[PDB]
């Protein structure tokens, strides 16, 4: 049977291949592959701590292979994987920019090629995948609303008041009380019941 969905998936697949190819083997004038620290997972044996917090470090050379197998299908998941390796790079390697300037350069050429490939995506996917040319590295829409400060309360309580103990959504940078959400104030990368609702299967019949 004919499916536009499988045509779109395979279309973008070989096309992602183009873009990710430029990034994987992106070289400076001295012929250095800047994406090297991201394209290869590190020796697992001497990194329990690393993989404890970063339980999903990811690997570009593997993402590449996963592109051709048509696992991502659309750009949604594709763009996720790329922005993931860059962000965890900047996260644990150092303060905030360790290899940052190196992989952010890749990221810049990534968005450039993203912008480039937006042509075909337009003809294939359309506008349901939007443009995704809003810069940044964290979120794409960023705002996606009206307000979203660091000091803003957002709990199911509805009080909008900074009382008791509460943690911060890594993406919203909003405050949610620990007792309500079922937290232990131990979360390093907590996400809210919106961005990524974490399901806790506590002995549910």
């Amino acid at each position: 049977s004919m499916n536009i969905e499988v045509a779109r998936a395979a279309r973008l697949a070989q096309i992602f291949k183009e873009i990710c190819d430029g990034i994987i083997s992106y070289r400076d004038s001295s012929q250095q592959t800047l994406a090297a620290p991201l394209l290869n997972l590190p020796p697992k044996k001497k990194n329990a701590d690393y993989y404890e917090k970063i339980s999903d470090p990811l690997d570009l050379s593997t993402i590449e292979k996963q592109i051709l197998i048509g696992y991502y299908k659309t750009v949604e998941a594709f763009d996720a994987d790329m922005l993931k390796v860059f962000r965890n790079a900047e996260k644990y390697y150092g303060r905030k920019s360790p290899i940052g300037r190196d992989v952010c350069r890749l990221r810049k050429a990534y968005y450039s090629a993203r912008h480039e490939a937006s042509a075909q995506i337009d003809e294939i996917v359309g506008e349901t995948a939007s443009e995704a040319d809003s810069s940044e590295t964290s979120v794409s829409e960023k705002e996606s609303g009206h307000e979203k400060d660091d000091d803003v309360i957002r709990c199911i309580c509805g009080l909008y008041k900074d009382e008791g103990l509460m943690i911060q959504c890594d993406k919203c940078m909003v405050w949610q009380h620990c007792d309500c959400m079922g937290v232990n104030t131990d979360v390093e990368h907590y996400l809210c019941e919106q961005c990524d609702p974490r399901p806790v299967d506590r002995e549910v019949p």
Partner: peptide, 12 residues
């Protein structure tokens, strides 16, 4: 992730 423990945290 930052953790608030009552908005006021005056220590002295």
């Amino acid at each position: 992730a930052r953790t608030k423990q009552t908005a006021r945290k005056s220590t002295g």
